[PDB]
Amino acid sequence: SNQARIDRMNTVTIKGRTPGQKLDRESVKNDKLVITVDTVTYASTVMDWQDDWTSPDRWAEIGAQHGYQHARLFDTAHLIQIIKARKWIAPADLKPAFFDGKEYTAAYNADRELFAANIIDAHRQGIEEMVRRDLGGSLTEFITVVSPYVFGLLLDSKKLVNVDYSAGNGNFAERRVGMVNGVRIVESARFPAAAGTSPLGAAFTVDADDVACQMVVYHPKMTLVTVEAKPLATNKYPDNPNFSDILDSFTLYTVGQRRPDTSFAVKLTNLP
Amino acid sequence: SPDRWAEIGAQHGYQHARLFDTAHLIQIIKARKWIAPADLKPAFFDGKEYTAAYNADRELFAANIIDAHRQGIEEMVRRDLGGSLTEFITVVSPYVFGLLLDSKKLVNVDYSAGNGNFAERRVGMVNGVRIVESARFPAAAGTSPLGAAFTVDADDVACQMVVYHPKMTLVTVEAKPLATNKYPDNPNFSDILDSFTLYTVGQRRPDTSFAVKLTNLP
Amino acid sequence: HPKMTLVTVEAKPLATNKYPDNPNFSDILDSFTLYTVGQRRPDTSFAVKLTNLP
Amino acid sequence: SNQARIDRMNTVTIKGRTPGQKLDRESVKNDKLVITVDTVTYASTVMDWQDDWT
Amino acid sequence: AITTGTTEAQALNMTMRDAVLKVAPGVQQLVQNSSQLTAAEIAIIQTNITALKAAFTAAGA
Amino acid sequence: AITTGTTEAQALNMTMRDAVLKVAPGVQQLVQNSSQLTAAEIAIIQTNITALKAAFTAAGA
Amino acid sequence: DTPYKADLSRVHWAGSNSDVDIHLEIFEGDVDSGFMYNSFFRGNSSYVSVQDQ
């Protein structure tokens, strides 16, 4: 098929009693979730026999070049889908057990230290919100992804690199930093650069507001789900009637959100 | 339909576990109002409460909180309890726990070396008493399943820091541990599942604890 | 046609259950089932209708 | 569950050709069928212990 | 126009879903067989259809 | 009013049934996730609902 | 532009033209619910038992 399903359920409530009284009972609610696959991504190349007979071989180079684009597109789609989950509003039927998606802002400043302080404050707010949801015991499993700009800005903060406060964390000269608010930091170059469309489909379009979010925190198990109908494959065949050869590579998959309650995004505002 | 009893059974226990700890804190938050009886006055002291002032700058607010804690520690020292500061415990909410780290004297190394680390979100002590973080503080005013003695007013909701002695402040009386029971109701077309317990929490020596309140929060 | 006209969908075949009711000093016996019927191929059947009956 | 599904499909047609001619193709079409169960039928009787013992 | 920003719009969007999912299983029965075409059930279908239009108008589609 | 037992009625009912299943999946995505809430996608749902209304009017429901 | 576009046979697509989706969902053992929690203050108090007295 081209769909998958996952179930959802609520919680219960406690009450009190005295001798001679009867116990009361309450109902429990439930819902569902579905994802679908809609698009095939490919790349093709053709050549003639006569040209192939009078030139050095070059098929290996093109074969090697084919997969880099696939990997880049996969990573870009992953990040784009992570970013978009900052606007969900939980339905009232699951309110006690499910929450909303969050977003926090950092104000641009001429000085770099103040900008870093604002960013760290937003991250702290997010971490406190996460801790309030009984998730504080698993902060060793969360991950923080920052674009190179934010990664460079983080080293300019008055702390996180100063031995007086954060001994053994980072080094300014060597461009190194390991942790913030108890969570790891990872640098990625796959963040979107400008508004536009994507080959995957219409669910991956990005506007000006989306591009401003250059920092996100998520759980690598309970946040996203990937649905796959055809893994990446290649096949080179000859077209005997036409005197030529062809090479193809194609795949079919998609990405969707599972629990937007375990992530948040930080937004930079009033940029030049 | 498919079977779904295991999840309900798990939630049944999670909810009891969540209620136990909040019922534990609600009683400590109320001891601040205790007044000793007249006949026992010379050997028994009244409970105490201290207030902190909200400010836009975070460091000044943290300083206010630290001074409020210090006042209570100094009061404790005067009752000949200063020789047992290693037995007391401090319970702080996530908000106040995050406010402490901003102070530039508990985490610095020129003062209080060896205590805490800014990048790792680590703090060890405050005024000689260790810190513990909990998320069980009451969020809104209302009644409780445990009776009228556990009602919380909009003033008890404002206390977010507490100090107490584990072995001398509270006492727990129990009559039946947690149990479960599932059974069919043959005369009807239904199946049922139940959980129940019987216990309470009381006050033994309210004069060994104090609470701090945050005022004028927006 | 006994093989292509109808279909039967069942969620519980016929069963029985006998139990006592202690507080009411009595005994009960029950039998129950849950099923339905539907049309699979109306193509292979027809009906004959009588008209103008008195 | 409480419902079941059955599929439906169309048929094809035959053609012919002489040498040099190509072959045509045809499109088939689909549909489905669904059934549901909602009601329970039962019977019940009750007896007293004093009459049962005698 | 449809909106998806706030809890006020969330309630209307949620109402539309369960308003349309009640209509969905009746139209299939209307066409797949002659078993359930009694005049007493077309009446229920009609009330569900009427409720669907009110849900759409309330949601502002 | 809805009618059955004729070719025209069957065609109208088939069209009304087929118009509903296009709207059916859109509403679920409208409320289950935030990945498909862009302004460009709600336009398709708007046209689907507009066609569903015309189908209802034509069928007479 | 494929020559076979007008004569395709689509399996789970009904209607006058193959546009309506009637596919089947695929389900496994996945159920999302509330997060877990464990008690912490169980040992910080004096305890007395009067269960059967």
Numbering used by the authors:
A (entry chain B): 56 to 327
B (entry chain A): 110 to 327
C (entry chain G): 274 to 327
D (entry chain G): 56 to 109
E (entry chain H), F (entry chain I): 2 to 62
G (entry chain A): 3 to 55
Authors' own words:
Podophages that infect gram-negative bacteria, such as Pectobacterium pathogen ΦM1, encode tail assemblies too short to extend across the complex gram-negative cell wall. To overcome this, podophages encode a large protein complex (ejectosome) packaged inside the viral capsid and correspondingly ejected during infection to form a transient channel that spans the periplasmic space. Here, we report a near-complete atomic model of the bacteriophage ΦM1.
Bacteriophage ΦM1 encloses the viral DNA within a highly decorated T = 7 icosahedral capsid composed of HK97-like major capsid proteins (MCPs) and two similar, but distinct, accessory proteins. Two decoration proteins, gp44 and gp43, are individually expressed off the viral genome and bind across MCPs at the 2-fold and quasi-2-fold axes of symmetry via formation of homodimeric α-helical bundles, where each dimerization domain consists of a helix–turn–helix motif. We refer to these bundle structures as α-claw motifs, as corresponding density bears resemblance to claw clips. The gp44 consists only of the α-claw motif, which we refer to as the α-claw protein. Gp43, however, also encodes a long helical fiber that we term the “forearm” domain. We refer to gp43 as the α-paw protein. While the α-claw is a small protein (∼6 kDa) and is composed primarily of two α-helices, the α-paw is nearly three times the size (∼17 kDa), due to the long C-terminal forearm domain. The α-claw and α-paw decoration proteins, although similar in the helix–turn–helix domain, may serve different functions during infection by virtue of their structures. Both decorations likely stabilize the capsid as they bind across MCPs, which is a common function for accessory proteins in large capsid viruses which can reach up to 60 atmospheric units of internal pressure once packaged. Given that the α-claw appears to form a stronger interface with MCPs and does not encode any additional fiber, we hypothesize that this protein is required to maintain capsid stability. In contrast, the α-paw likely contributes to stability to a lesser extent but may mediate additional functions via the fibrous α-paw forearm domain, such as host recognition and adhesion.
